[PDB]
């Protein structure tokens, strides 16, 4: 894949569509984890969206590898594909306005949603914004924050629980707080450092370049 592509930002701490298996031909789905941010060993964990026990773990969250260059996770519906075709693919995205643009982020997709347009990264980062569905309810009594969109400020993250902090403050510390930035993109092969976090690679990652740092 490449093209041209529209964000959003989110984190609803509900199991990843991609920790299933049988989702596409990958060495092991992306790991889910319990209510306490630890992983679960069984793949097939209901979701605690839907009355369950797995939830998307802290790990799968951004970071900057430097003031020009970030590495996380997203949701997203890639025109012309399907589940079988992203999930655990690897993203360059090149930003192309807001604070961020000229930047760029290589991103995991470990998810979708029927919400999601063509060509739509909804990429990850605690206080991002829930959605329709609340899973950090459950999960811990819920996160601060507009039901989309989430946070305002940095200083909330300060409520945030510990493993997802850091992800919390990534948004206004490498990403500036931009608000639903464009980019262009190019499927790459993934980081190991993103692979080491979800677990996940495509048996297809290798026939897709090295992204251009
Ligand atoms: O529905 C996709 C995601 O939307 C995120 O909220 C958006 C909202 O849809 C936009 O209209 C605008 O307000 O920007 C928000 C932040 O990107 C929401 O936070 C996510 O949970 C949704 O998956
Ligand atoms: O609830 C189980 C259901 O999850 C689906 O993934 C959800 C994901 O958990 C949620 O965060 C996002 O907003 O919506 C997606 C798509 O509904 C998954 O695709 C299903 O296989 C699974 O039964």
Redesign the pocket.
């Known amino acids: 894949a490449s093209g041209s592509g529209q964000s959003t930002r989110y984190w609803?701490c509900?199991?990843?569509?991609c920790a299933?298996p049988g989702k596409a031909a990958v060495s092991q789905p992306v790991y889910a984890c319990d209510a306490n941010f630890q992983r679960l060993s069984d793949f097939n964990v209901q979701?605690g969206?839907?009355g369950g026990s797995a939830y998307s773990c802290a790990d799968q969250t951004p970071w900057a590898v430097n003031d020009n260059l970030a590495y996380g996770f997203a949701?997203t519906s890639i025109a012309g594909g399907s589940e079988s075709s992203w999930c655990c693919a690897c993203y360059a995205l090149t930003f192309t306005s807001g604070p961020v643009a000229g930047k760029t982020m290589v991103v995991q997709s470990t998810?979708?949603?029927?919400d999601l347009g063509s060509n739509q990264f909804d990429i990850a980062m605690p206080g991002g914004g829930v959605?329709?569905?609340n899973?950090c309810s459950s999960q811990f009594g819920g996160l601060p924050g507009a039901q989309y969109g989430g946070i305002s400020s940095r200083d909330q993250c300060d409520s945030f629980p510990a493993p997802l902090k850091p992800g919390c403050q990534w948004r206004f510390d490498w990403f500036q707080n931009a608000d639903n930035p464009t980019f262009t993109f190019q499927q790459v092969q993934c980081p190991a450092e993103i692979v080491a976090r979800s677990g996940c690679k495509r048996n297809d990652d290798s026939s897709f370049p090295v992204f251009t740092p």
């Open positions: 609803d509900c199991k990843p569509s299933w979701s969206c839907n949701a998810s979708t949603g029927g959605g329709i569905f899973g």
